[PDB]
Amino acid sequence: GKYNLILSEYLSFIYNSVQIPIYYSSNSELENRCIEFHSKCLENSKNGLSLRKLFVEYNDVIENATLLSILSYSYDKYNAVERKLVKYAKGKPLEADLTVNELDYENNKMTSELFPTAEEYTDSLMDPAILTSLSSNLNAVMFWLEKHENDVAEKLKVYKRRLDLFTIVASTINKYGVPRHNAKYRYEYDVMKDKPYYLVTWANSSIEMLMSVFSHDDYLIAKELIVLSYSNRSTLAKLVSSPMSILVALVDINGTFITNEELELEFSNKYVRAIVPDQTFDELNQMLDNMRKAGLVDIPKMIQDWLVDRSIEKFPLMAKIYSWSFHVGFRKQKMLDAALDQEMYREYTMLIRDEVVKMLEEPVKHDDHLLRDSELAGLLSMSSASNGESRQLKFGRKTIFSTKKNMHVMDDMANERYTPGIIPPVNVDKPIPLGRRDVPGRRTRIIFILPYEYFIAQHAVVEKMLIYAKHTREYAEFYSQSNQLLSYGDVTRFLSNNTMVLYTDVSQWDSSQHNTQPFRKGIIMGLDILANMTNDAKVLQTLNLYKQTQINLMDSYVQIPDGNVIKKIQYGAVASGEKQTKAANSIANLALIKTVLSRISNKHSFATKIIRVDGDDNYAVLQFNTEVTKQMIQDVSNDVRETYARMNAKVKALVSTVGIEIAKRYIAGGKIFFRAGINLLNNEKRGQSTQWDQAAILYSNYIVNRLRGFETDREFILTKIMQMTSVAITGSLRLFPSERVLTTNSTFKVFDSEDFIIEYGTTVDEVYIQRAFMSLSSQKSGIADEIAASSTFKNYVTRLSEQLLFSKNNIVSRGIALTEKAKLNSYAPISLEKRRAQISALLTMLQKPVTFKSSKITINDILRDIKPFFTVSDAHLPIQYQKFMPTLPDNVQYIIQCIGSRTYQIEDDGSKSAISRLISKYSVYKPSIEELYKVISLHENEIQLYLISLGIPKIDADTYVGSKIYSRDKYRILESYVYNLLSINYGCYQLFDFNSPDLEKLIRIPFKGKIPAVTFILHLYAKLEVINYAIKNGSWISLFCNYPKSEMIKLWKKMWNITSLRSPYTNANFF
């Protein structure tokens, strides 16, 4: 509710020259009243008359109706920024020490210097890539200051800090003026030509950080990073963070949580003295010195103060620094520079091959259908395939520039060009294009761009590999539904005064030219061993083709650009872009640690308690037949590093007894920590999202950060959403959508009216509007249909089906078509056509509805029904579980303190149902949860044919149709579908133990009848309600349910008719 009013301040603030609110309502009489009020308002304003009398004359509308949006009639130029900024340009502009960046262009020179001519300029090195403007950020920041220019006490101090800092930004920007952004939110050459090239991105990062300060320390930190970043743009993030790895080893462990036999976090009182060798301390001093010799002052001092007592109680600060260092921006260097950085392997490669074999040993001999029909599966998977060059195409009688790999298959099949048995050579003749991945505080890494023959020859094998990983704990990333918490508990588990932990950072090793030979040799060798295990042509064909991918790779040239020209150099290193990348990479990393660990054993005798891999990090807790001495840790670390050295591999091999740090999570003090640095006002790359989705994505990012540590002031975020959602109907009239429009659960929902809490239509208006929004949810694309009209699409679908179907498969057939018609929009002409057209419908939609033939039901309709049958009464819950994720906001942390947390994901795809397993056991097809949901809701007779249509044997198909297991399977499919619709696995809920004994007691539900469906929803609805109350009140409530037996049947029908609401931005899923 505060969002709608706040928006008024923002509009009045920006415009000084009318504001015509717009109210809608389910009530019919009120609605006409709303229209009268609206009509009179325009007339009064377009006649320069008051509006105070009208508002009094429509108190019913203000008080009883819903605000739909607020129109804004303006007539200036939106150049209020130039005028407002000057008041803050009092400070002295910053001067960048152009003598800081090893790479010339990394230095913050004058654009006209880095790019003398227009045809030479390229924002490719600083592009915020975000659909919001710098002026907007400046405008948004100014609005907050105007509003909090009179706050008192501590609130004021936040202002003084915010005021000070902002001045650095205002003062510097003012010197060169505020850069103007074009429709594409890019920054052209003329505006940029006389300004410090890295200005715009810097302002975003400085603004993002200064609007994230609260305590004094935040200020020094925001202040130091803000200033040094202006000149340093290549080591500030790396330097500020770097010491965090050594710091974790420093603090002891006073009580920590572990992983018990039931693989659930269990509080242990164990104590472990964090003992570190002398040399390790020096390593940390150098990190501090490097930080110091680089300009830093206060931040280094802080860590220094921390090291005097190294009290986990004062560790929170060390965390704020490591998280903050990331908000300095993205290191976007020239592609070539990024590309440029790139006998005793018998033991190493041997393990890689062997691991490959195990993952594919049983499947190969049996002649798994997946291996035999690998071509269809890979073909089907294309939707979840990488990306290829934006080729040229023709379908029917037109031309397009699609970059999606799946479409390439369509053009090629309908052109006799499709030839998967022949995987294009990736060398001098036909080199590999290039893609990239940027990340704060790390050298840019490149991404191959192999054709589709490569994905196809890699999907089945990798998929089969993963299943093995899925049940192997060594691969801490894949194992079961495991969440990061399980991984956290496993490490603390064996930690004792007779066991030292060892972590590494093999990121560079995965791209070390040295690595490619072994890596490829092992994969190929294993394929050879597997091939001499079967006599199946389909499998051997697949086993062989995969082998070739490695051979073509062994010698791969790269189409590396070097200006407006495309050079072409060699490349003896391995990069990402293959299916096997993430999976195979782990195999190698695991293979590497096994090799190093075994070799070091020659000297000291230990016991490998646990070994794990996780992308660019691999660790292990080894136990010693005696107490660990500083000398011992120093010796083992040396032996480990030298070993890594012998294999000529750049790595960060550290060793501790109580903590570990890695790219995804750091365990300092026996407590689990997560970094919180997701740049909010500077995106990595310019995707295909829209301004609206950009905002919902921004809010998602904000919540993840708040949950992890970093916290950008929510008022600022509200301001951005206000700027990002608004849309103009004229050149002097913008339409700012209301809070109800913005937060109501729909396909346009951007945020929540209370972070961490999701609401659902409870009032008539919310539902009235809720049903109304679904209407214009999916608007056809005058391209996505014609594409399915050409022989190409029809041949491709039929061609895929002809080898997938037998009977009348159309339920399956209808889905495949939309499977493509759902991604096809990607193609600019379709995403842009749909996005631009949506605005006309959306603008008109706010105008006048009242005419909708609703009939479809959703979670909103179902939940609204159950509400009246729940009787709430104050209940009490004591805090018993300790803390292990110290950064969690108090309200969130409180729930875990009372009901606990889970170290698992809640099955939300039906993957663990008997029917699914059967469909998988024989057919390669993979029906989504939605399909399983629709299929399960069918009659026994229909369901039986579905299985046959895919290939399940009739004896077996018939057994399922009757069997008791099928009935239960009907319950499980619904459960997965429901949980999916509640995002119970994403957001903050993924951190709550929804089966907590403590939470369960607070719910009271009598079994009117053994009806698993209804009993299930009443309970989950009961649990969500209690949790949400907890978050928004700090106190608990107990719910009672007396749902009549009659009502249950009506509700039961509703359960199998719930539709969805797409919006992917809501994505908060972080661990």
Side-chain angles (χ1 to χ4, degrees), residues 1-852 854-1071:
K2 300 298 190 182
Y3 169 104
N4 260 316
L5 286 314
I6 277 191
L7 184 132
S8 164
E9 298 159 300
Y10 174 79
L11 291 199
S12 81
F13 173 75
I14 301 300
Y15 315 102
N16 313 63
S17 173
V18 302
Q19 277 175 54
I20 306 304
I22 301 290
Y23 292 70
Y24 85 86
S25 188
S26 48
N27 207 66
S28 194
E29 325 180 12
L30 197 66
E31 237 304 289
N32 284 180
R33 279 279 289 172
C34 285
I35 304 167
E36 284 191 303
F37 169 66
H38 175 186
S39 75
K40 288 186 174 178
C41 280
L42 268 38
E43 231 49 33
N44 266 193
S45 301
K46 66 158 290 294
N47 255 78
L49 278 172
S50 175
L51 282 194
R52 168 188 170 295
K53 283 285 193 184
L54 266 178
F55 280 32
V56 177
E57 193 216 299
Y58 281 101
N59 187 54
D60 51 0
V61 193
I62 324 298
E63 200 177 5
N64 311 298
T66 27
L67 185 70
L68 194 51
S69 71
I70 315 187
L71 283 52
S72 183
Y73 162 60
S74 56
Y75 250 164
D76 288 351
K77 261 186 67 182
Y78 275 114
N79 70 296
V81 189
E82 320 293 329
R83 308 181 182 183
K84 291 179 192 302
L85 190 64
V86 189
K87 305 149 189 171
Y88 304 107
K90 297 299 187 174
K92 51 184 75 178
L94 284 80
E95 219 67 283
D97 171 41
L98 282 41
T99 79
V100 186
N101 299 274
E102 201 101 336
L103 294 157
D104 45 294
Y105 67 114
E106 288 196 303
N107 298 286
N108 190 40
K109 295 177 188 180
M110 290 280 146
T111 309
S112 65
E113 310 285 303
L114 296 130
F115 304 107
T117 22
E119 296 54 44
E120 271 309 299
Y121 171 61
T122 172
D123 60 38
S124 165
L125 295 177
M126 57 102 230
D127 173 35
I130 203 173
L131 277 57
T132 199
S133 42
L134 159 71
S135 44
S136 293
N137 302 307
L138 289 182
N139 248 190
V141 167
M142 288 184 282
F143 171 56
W144 183 89
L145 300 168
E146 205 267 59
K147 297 304 154 177
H148 305 53
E149 184 184 16
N150 321 74
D151 276 60
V152 304
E154 197 57 44
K155 295 281 293 310
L156 167 72
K157 297 189 167 190
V158 165
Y159 168 60
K160 288 293 178 192
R161 305 192 176 64
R162 257 72 164 304
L163 165 78
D164 182 76
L165 287 176
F166 178 56
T167 276
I168 277 185
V169 186
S171 306
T172 301
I173 294 303
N174 149 279
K175 179 183 183 179
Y176 313 88
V178 181
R180 250 172 58 229
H181 56 106
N182 65 151
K184 275 84 151 182
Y185 284 98
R186 258 183 180 74
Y187 299 97
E188 319 215 84
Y189 175 62
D190 46 299
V191 276
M192 292 311 289
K193 189 181 79 73
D194 318 63
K195 315 196 182 184
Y197 188 59
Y198 282 117
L199 185 66
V200 178
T201 169
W202 173 72
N204 296 309
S205 291
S206 315
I207 297 172
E208 163 184 344
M209 284 184 289
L210 81 83
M211 281 273 74
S212 273
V213 185
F214 292 107
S215 92
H216 183 61
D217 290 301
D218 302 327
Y219 170 69
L220 290 163
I221 298 185
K223 199 185 179 60
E224 188 153 325
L225 287 174
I226 279 186
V227 188
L228 263 72
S229 84
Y230 188 29
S231 322
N232 173 310
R233 289 285 275 87
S234 34
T235 50
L236 187 49
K238 163 213 292 282
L239 268 177
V240 174
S241 65
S242 29
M244 180 66 264
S245 64
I246 291 287
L247 303 163
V248 320
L250 309 189
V251 174
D252 298 347
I253 279 180
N254 287 153
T256 185
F257 284 93
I258 71 91
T259 312
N260 51 20
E261 26 204 348
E262 265 297 76
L263 305 180
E264 32 164 63
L265 281 166
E266 173 170 281
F267 176 81
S268 182
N269 92 329
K270 57 121 114 300
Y271 166 77
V272 232
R273 180 118 71 70
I275 59 178
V276 293
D278 291 309
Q279 71 103 199
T280 285
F281 260 116
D282 307 331
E283 292 172 44
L284 176 46
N285 283 126
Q286 224 121 184
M287 310 212 200
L288 279 174
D289 269 310
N290 296 315
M291 271 201 292
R292 306 156 190 283
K293 310 303 156 56
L296 285 63
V297 196
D298 283 320
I299 285 183
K301 194 275 215 62
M302 299 183 150
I303 301 177
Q304 202 56 253
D305 297 342
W306 189 80
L307 256 87
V308 307
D309 53 1
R310 303 178 305 167
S311 57
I312 182 65
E313 295 75 12
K314 286 203 287 291
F315 191 77
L317 188 41
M318 298 300 102
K320 204 184 275 65
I321 314 284
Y322 178 20
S323 302
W324 276 71
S325 68
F326 262 52
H327 302 278
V328 285
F330 285 94
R331 186 173 171 178
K332 296 168 198 162
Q333 41 185 307
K334 286 164 182 171
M335 258 300 240
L336 170 41
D337 258 301
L340 186 69
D341 187 10
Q342 68 76 41
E343 52 143 354
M344 292 319 114
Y345 293 174
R346 171 195 292 181
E347 184 172 294
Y348 171 71
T349 304
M350 223 104 101
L351 261 162
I352 295 166
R353 164 207 53 179
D354 280 11
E355 207 62 36
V356 180
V357 172
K358 293 144 59 184
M359 312 189 170
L360 317 146
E361 200 158 49
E362 283 304 295
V364 163
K365 44 170 54 65
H366 289 165
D367 287 295
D368 200 86
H369 87 282
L370 181 42
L371 296 197
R372 300 171 93 289
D373 279 305
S374 60
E375 191 159 316
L376 186 63
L379 242 155
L380 297 166
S381 300
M382 290 306 272
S383 165
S384 67
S386 303
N387 260 286
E389 31 246 292
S390 59
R391 302 179 64 183
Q392 177 174 292
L393 323 79
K394 46 175 170 45
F395 299 114
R397 193 197 298 176
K398 294 194 72 65
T399 57
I400 57 172
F401 266 111
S402 169
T403 166
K404 290 294 173 288
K405 319 185 72 170
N406 70 66
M407 288 192 57
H408 302 330
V409 193
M410 312 204 301
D411 221 89
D412 294 17
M413 292 183 132
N415 261 185
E416 302 276 352
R417 316 181 306 189
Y418 173 63
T419 315
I422 308 177
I423 39 182
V426 283
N427 56 42
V428 58
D429 301 307
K430 190 187 177 192
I432 303 69
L434 229 56
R436 23 157 28 195
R437 170 185 174 58
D438 298 292
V439 53
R442 190 168 279 287
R443 287 215 52 176
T444 304
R445 274 172 308 307
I446 76 157
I447 313 169
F448 271 41
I449 290 295
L450 310 172
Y452 72 61
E453 288 83 343
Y454 282 105
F455 178 58
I456 274 63
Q458 276 213 141
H459 176 61
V461 178
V462 177
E463 269 320 322
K464 280 309 181 191
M465 287 194 277
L466 291 189
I467 292 168
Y468 179 91
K470 182 64 162 50
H471 60 62
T472 322
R473 307 199 72 185
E474 278 62 27
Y475 295 83
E477 178 156 303
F478 305 123
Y479 194 60
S480 54
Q481 292 149 283
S482 85
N483 77 337
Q484 304 237 182
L485 289 185
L486 166 47
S487 299
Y488 150 55
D490 261 320
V491 177
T492 86
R493 162 88 274 259
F494 296 128
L495 294 183
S496 306
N497 64 162
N498 88 326
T499 167
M500 52 183 85
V501 68
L502 165 162
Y503 43 112
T504 296
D505 177 17
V506 284
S507 42
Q508 311 293 50
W509 168 232
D510 296 319
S511 81
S512 183
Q513 294 184 59
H514 292 281
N515 187 57
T516 187
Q517 286 283 316
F519 180 80
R520 300 300 186 190
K521 289 187 61 176
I523 298 191
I524 300 177
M525 287 175 76
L527 285 148
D528 302 309
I529 299 168
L530 301 179
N532 204 231
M533 296 190 112
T534 177
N535 329 294
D536 207 287
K538 286 282 200 172
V539 155
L540 275 171
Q541 163 74 334
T542 310
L543 258 162
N544 178 53
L545 263 179
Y546 198 91
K547 179 168 65 282
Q548 188 47 290
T549 75
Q550 304 311 76
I551 292 181
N552 288 38
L553 294 168
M554 289 286 251
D555 197 53
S556 59
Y557 288 66
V558 189
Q559 195 190 55
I560 292 175
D562 179 51
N564 301 310
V565 172
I566 293 82
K567 195 152 290 179
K568 190 180 306 299
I569 84 166
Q570 224 178 69
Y571 209 103
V574 163
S576 69
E578 312 178 49
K579 180 75 171 190
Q580 68 139 45
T581 297
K582 203 183 289 181
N585 198 63
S586 299
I587 305 184
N589 285 315
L590 181 32
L592 181 86
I593 168 184
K594 280 190 177 170
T595 312
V596 161
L597 220 72
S598 73
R599 172 69 80 177
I600 77 158
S601 182
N602 274 303
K603 273 181 67 181
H604 6 50
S605 62
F606 49 51
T608 332
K609 298 310 290 176
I610 83 168
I611 284 178
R612 299 267 179 308
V613 327
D614 242 271
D616 313 321
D617 293 88
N618 70 56
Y619 45 96
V621 170
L622 307 87
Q623 196 168 59
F624 286 99
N625 281 59
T626 191
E627 205 179 324
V628 180
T629 46
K630 305 175 61 167
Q631 171 80 79
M632 292 175 102
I633 312 175
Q634 193 187 296
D635 288 300
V636 186
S637 173
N638 299 158
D639 296 35
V640 185
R641 286 169 170 178
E642 206 73 299
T643 305
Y644 268 126
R646 178 45 249 172
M647 298 182 70
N648 235 69
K650 277 290 180 292
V651 293
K652 178 200 68 55
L654 256 55
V655 172
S656 183
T657 53
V658 295
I660 78 93
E661 189 229 17
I662 59 185
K664 287 187 177 288
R665 40 158 187 294
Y666 56 109
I667 314 163
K671 304 176 176 299
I672 193 58
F673 290 65
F674 287 93
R675 217 212 284 77
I678 292 171
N679 297 276
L680 200 58
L681 298 161
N682 269 308
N683 292 151
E684 195 214 318
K685 57 204 173 184
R686 278 163 161 275
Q688 55 291 289
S689 315
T690 86
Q691 200 168 170
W692 266 56
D693 312 337
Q694 226 86 99
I697 295 180
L698 180 156
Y699 176 73
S700 165
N701 272 357
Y702 147 79
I703 291 292
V704 185
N705 279 353
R706 179 133 110 65
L707 289 166
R708 259 114 165 272
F710 193 78
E711 178 200 320
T712 300
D713 188 300
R714 199 189 133 96
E715 260 183 64
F716 185 65
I717 306 282
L718 291 173
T719 336
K720 297 302 297 164
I721 279 163
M722 283 178 253
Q723 304 175 335
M724 282 159 91
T725 67
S726 49
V727 191
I729 302 76
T730 76
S732 80
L733 172 144
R734 184 142 293 167
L735 179 120
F736 298 80
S738 54
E739 187 195 311
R740 176 53 46 70
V741 177
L742 291 181
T743 31
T744 179
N745 168 208
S746 170
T747 51
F748 301 129
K749 199 209 63 163
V750 158
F751 63 121
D752 312 295
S753 314
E754 167 82 5
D755 306 322
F756 305 144
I757 286 184
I758 308 164
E759 305 308 58
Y760 291 113
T762 314
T763 73
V764 198
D765 293 309
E766 280 183 285
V767 271
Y768 167 64
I769 200 67
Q770 214 150 56
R771 279 177 217 158
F773 278 135
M774 295 201 281
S775 295
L776 62 159
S777 60
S778 180
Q779 297 306 289
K780 295 178 294 182
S781 176
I783 301 179
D785 305 305
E786 56 182 56
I787 180 58
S790 284
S791 71
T792 59
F793 213 131
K794 295 172 171 287
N795 289 173
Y796 182 53
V797 178
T798 299
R799 187 166 168 175
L800 295 163
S801 309
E802 278 183 293
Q803 279 187 178
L804 189 67
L805 336 177
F806 307 121
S807 69
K808 198 66 182 300
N809 253 301
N810 302 55
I811 283 296
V812 178
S813 307
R814 58 167 63 184
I816 302 172
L818 295 167
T819 302
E820 331 294 49
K821 300 180 187 174
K823 190 201 305 79
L824 281 158
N825 181 65
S826 56
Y827 179 58
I830 305 183
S831 55
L832 300 173
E833 180 98 0
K834 178 169 292 186
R835 159 76 175 181
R836 293 186 65 273
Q838 175 48 55
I839 287 184
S840 298
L842 167 58
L843 296 171
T844 49
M845 158 54 227
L846 264 59
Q847 190 58 66
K848 296 171 171 59
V850 81
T851 55
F852 293 111
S854 56
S855 180
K856 295 211 169 189
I857 36 171
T858 56
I859 201 82
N860 281 283
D861 308 70
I862 283 177
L863 298 180
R864 172 173 168 54
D865 295 18
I866 324 181
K867 210 202 176 190
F869 300 82
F870 265 100
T871 342
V872 308
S873 76
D874 287 3
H876 167 263
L877 244 54
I879 61 193
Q880 67 202 82
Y881 305 100
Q882 295 82 340
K883 290 167 175 173
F884 59 104
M885 306 191 265
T887 39
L888 280 159
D890 302 311
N891 68 171
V892 193
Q893 188 80 70
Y894 179 66
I895 311 306
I896 291 177
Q897 299 219 83
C898 298
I899 75 171
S901 187
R902 70 178 186 290
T903 85
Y904 66 82
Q905 299 284 285
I906 309 172
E907 158 76 349
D908 66 321
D909 52 353
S911 52
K912 285 196 161 191
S913 61
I915 169 182
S916 173
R917 265 51 194 291
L918 204 75
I919 305 171
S920 280
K921 171 69 176 294
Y922 303 110
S923 204
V924 109
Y925 183 57
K926 288 161 285 194
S928 62
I929 186 63
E930 286 270 16
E931 196 162 302
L932 265 167
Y933 171 68
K934 211 180 187 301
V935 155
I936 205 62
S937 311
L938 295 183
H939 291 305
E940 310 193 6
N941 303 154
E942 334 180 60
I943 295 189
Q944 188 175 62
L945 279 67
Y946 183 87
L947 286 152
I948 313 159
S949 77
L950 300 181
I952 298 67
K954 189 162 291 174
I955 171 185
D956 246 348
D958 282 46
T959 300
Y960 172 90
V961 190
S963 61
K964 64 190 73 179
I965 300 181
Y966 153 59
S967 69
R968 181 196 300 160
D969 213 307
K970 292 180 66 292
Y971 168 52
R972 293 206 265 189
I973 299 307
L974 167 142
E975 254 202 300
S976 277
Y977 189 84
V978 169
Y979 282 131
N980 182 286
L981 299 185
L982 302 159
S983 310
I984 207 179
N985 252 335
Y986 308 122
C988 97
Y989 292 141
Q990 80 174 301
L991 294 62
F992 297 154
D993 182 4
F994 270 140
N995 289 183
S996 157
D998 300 289
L999 170 55
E1000 216 117 73
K1001 71 201 280 186
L1002 285 195
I1003 310 296
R1004 306 143 76 192
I1005 293 181
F1007 293 99
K1008 308 280 181 172
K1010 289 171 67 178
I1011 182 172
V1014 185
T1015 310
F1016 164 56
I1017 181 62
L1018 304 162
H1019 269 273
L1020 187 57
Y1021 174 74
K1023 293 176 177 163
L1024 300 176
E1025 284 281 307
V1026 172
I1027 290 283
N1028 279 46
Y1029 192 83
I1031 298 179
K1032 196 164 193 168
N1033 282 276
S1035 28
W1036 307 82
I1037 45 170
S1038 189
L1039 283 42
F1040 172 73
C1041 179
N1042 62 303
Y1043 210 66
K1045 299 172 178 62
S1046 315
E1047 293 285 289
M1048 316 185 114
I1049 266 64
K1050 317 182 188 64
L1051 170 55
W1052 189 81
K1053 186 65 267 179
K1054 279 178 170 299
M1055 297 293 263
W1056 316 71
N1057 288 89
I1058 325 170
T1059 38
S1060 302
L1061 297 164
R1062 306 192 168 194
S1063 225
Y1065 322 114
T1066 325
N1067 261 31
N1069 42 226
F1070 74 106
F1071 67 80

